[PDB]
Every structure is written in structure tokens, then in C-alpha cells.
């Protein structure tokens, strides 16, 4: 993001305005160009490159601060609260997944027949198509957080 | 090799068996083999009768013992889920 600029001298318009040396960073900076308004600043102005520096120690903790933010304080609290969740209304949330698996599949079982009508994968789409990946991933989250029960509750 | 199998296969599991009734299988008259069985089995020796106490035997529950392998099986099961992944 951000940006950076520099003012070229306007009284130099009689002499050569065309440096620089080590044109590498110049080439990567002027790119992409990227519309018009951006190019309207090539005259009277020129940009200047930006690069981060580390400072990797504090950056390492700065990663772990946001990542650990999702984690709990004691780490046994919200996971055991998800174990309280592991049977809620989770049998009812699994009934939510069961309705997605009936309703999406009986209409996705007509698709193998419809492929013979259109012959074969021409546009399309419907849809009503796939979406079982998210259902399997949520069910896998359910079974893993539920597998934590035998680990936590026991000892 | 049959006679020791009388002792092994009678219990478990029978509640009780009368004296002379087991004497009908051991044959003889009043053998010392049934005394040696009163040692080997142990098990119980009762008056004019016998007993499988106690009780039938050892009373497996097994309570929290199988919960360890019930957690353990799910450990490697989840590992198979992660191998997909």
C-alpha cells in the first residue's frame, strides 16, 4: 500500500531530466502504470522506492500476539467451552448439516442425469452445485472438537 | 490332557455344582486329584457342594480403563483424518 513521491526541479527543464543510476528499483517502481492519473505525476514528480526492514524479533512476537489472540488464556477454557458445545444443540447443529446433506444431494443426484441431457459440461452452472466440501469441513471440525472430549474430560 | 480340561471348562462360568456330581466325572472314588484341584483351581471348596465365588469372576466393569484406549483409538483416527488431509 502506502506511496512515496519526490519533487523534481522545474527550473531544470532546459537540462537533462533523465537520471538515474541503478535503474532496477526505478523499473519496478514506475510499474505497473496502472491507469492515467498515476502517469499524470511522472512530470514534475518522481516516486521513490519503499522497503521494509526487520526488526525481526519484535516482528516475531507481533505475529504471535495476533495469532495467540484467537487462542485462549489458559487454553483449557474455551476449548472446554467448545466441549460444552460439543453436545448442545450440536446434535441439532448436526441436524442442520443433515438437512444440507439431504436437500443439496437429492438435487445433485439429478445432475448426473442432466449431464446426459445437455452432453455434457456446457454452461451451466445451476446452482445448487457442490457445497458439500464446506459441509464435510464443518463436520470434521465437529468430530475433532468432539474427539477432544476423551482427552480433556478424562484426566 | 482331557482331565485338566474338565477343571478349566467347568468354570467359568457355573454358579455351583454338587459334590458327587463332579465326582461322577472325575471317576475313581475319592481321588487326590480333586484335592490337587482344590489347590490348583482356588476357587472355593465348600461342604457337599462347590462355588465359583467370587464372583464369576473378578467382575470386569471396566469403568475408566477402556476410556484410555477409547481416547487412544481416536488419536490415530484423527491422524488418519489429517493424512488426507
Q: Tell me which H or E stretch contains B25.
A: helix B19-26
Contact status of A147 with chain B (Cβ, < 8 Å): yes
B 33-62 → A contacts, CB under 8 A: none
Mutate to test the interface with A, among B68, B71, B82, B84 (most CBs of A within 10 A): B71
Contact between A150 and B77 using a beta-carbon 8 Å cutoff: no
Q: Which residues pair with A6 in a beta bridge?
A: A46
Place of cell 459334590: B19
Angle, vertex CA A85, rays to CA A82 and CA A87, nearest 5? 135
Please state, in angstroms and rounded to a whole number, the distance separating the CA atoms of residues B28 and B49: 18
Q: Which residues pair with A5 in a beta bridge?
A: A47
Nearest of A101, B29, B21 to residue B6 by alpha carbon: B21
Place of cell 489429517: B82
Nearest of B13, B8, B22, B7 to residue B58 by alpha carbon: B13
Q: What is the DSSP string of A7-18?
A: EPPSTTTTS---
Neighbours of A86 (CB within 10 A): 20
From which experimental method does this structure derive? cryo-EM
Q: Tell me which H or E stretch contains B77.
A: helix B65-82
In eight-state DSSP terms, residue B16 is -
Give the distance from CA A82 to its chain's centroid. 25
Nearest CA to CA, how far is B71 from chain A (Å)? 5
For strands A45-47 and A5-7, give the pairing.
antiparallel
Contacts 24+ apart (CB under 8 A), A120-129: A128/A104
Give the distance from CA A143 to its chain's centroid. 25
Mutate to test the interface with A, among B62, B64, B70, B74 (most CBs of A within 10 A): B74
Please state, in angstroms and rounded to a whole number, the distance separating the CA atoms of residues A138 and B83: 17
Contact between B74 and A150 using a beta-carbon 8 Å cutoff: yes
Check if the beta carbon of residue A7 is closer than 8 Å to that of residue A45: yes
Chain length of chain B: 85
Residues A99, A103, A109, A111: what is their CA dihedral angle, to the nearest 10 degrees? Answer: -140
Residue B59 burial (C-beta neighbours within 10 Å; 0-12, 13-18, 19+): exposed
Contacts of A140 in chain B (CB under 8 A): 81
Indicate left, alpha or beta for A124 from its phi (over 0: left) and psi (-120 to 50: alpha): left
Judge if the upstream peptide bond of residue B77 is cis by omega within 30 degrees of 0: no
Check if the beta carbon of residue A54 is closer than 8 Å to that of residue A13: no
Cell triple for residue A30?
Answer: 514506475
Please state, in angstroms and rounded to a whole number, the distance separating the CA atoms of residues A113 and A106: 12
Check if the beta carbon of residue B3 is closer than 8 Å to that of residue B37: no
Q: Tell me which H or E stretch contains B75.
A: helix B65-82
Contact between A154 and B68 using a beta-carbon 8 Å cutoff: yes
Q: Tell me which H or E stretch contains A6.
A: strand A5-7
Amino acid at each position: 500500500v502506502i506511496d512515496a513521491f519526490r519533487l523534481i526541479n522545474a527550473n531544470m527543464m532546459v537540462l537533462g531530466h533523465e537520471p538515474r543510476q541503478t535503474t532496477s528499483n526505478l523499473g519496478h517502481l514506475n510499474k505497473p502504470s496502472i491507469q492515467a492519473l498515476i502517469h499524470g505525476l511522472n512530470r514534475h514528480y518522481y516516486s521513490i522506492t519503499i522497503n521494509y526492514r526487520k526488526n525481526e524479533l519484535e516482528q516475531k512476537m507481533l505475529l504471535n500476539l495476533h495469532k495467540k489472540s484467537w487462542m485462549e488464556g489458559l487454553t483449557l477454557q474455551d476449548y472446554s467451552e467448545h466441549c460444552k458445545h460439543n453436545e448442545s444443540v450440536v446434535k441439532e447443529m448436526l441436524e442442520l448439516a443433515k438437512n444440507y446433506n439431504k436437500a443439496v444431494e437429492e438435487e445433485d443426484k439429478m445432475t448426473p442425469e442432466q449431464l446426459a441431457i445437455k452432453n455434457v459440461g456446457k454452461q451451466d452452472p445451476k446452482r445448487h452445485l457442490e457445497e458439500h466440501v464446506d459441509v464435510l469441513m464443518t463436520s470434521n471440525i465437529v468430530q475433532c472438537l468432539a474427539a477432544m472430549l476423551d482427552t480433556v474430560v478424562f484426566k | 490332557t482331557i482331565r485338566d480340561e474338565i477343571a478349566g471348562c467347568i468354570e467359568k462360568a457355573y454358579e455351583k455344582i454338587l459334590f458327587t456330581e463332579a465326582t461322577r466325572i472325575l471317576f475313581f472314588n475319592t481321588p487326590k486329584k480333586m484335592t490337587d484341584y482344590a489347590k490348583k483351581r482356588g476357587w472355593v471348596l465348600g461342604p457337599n457342594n462347590y462355588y465359583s465365588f467370587a464372583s464369576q469372576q473378578q467382575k470386569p466393569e471396566d469403568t475408566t480403563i477402556p476410556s484410555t484406549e477409547l481416547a487412544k483409538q481416536v488419536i490415530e483416527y484423527a491422524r488418519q483424518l489429517e493424512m488426507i488431509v
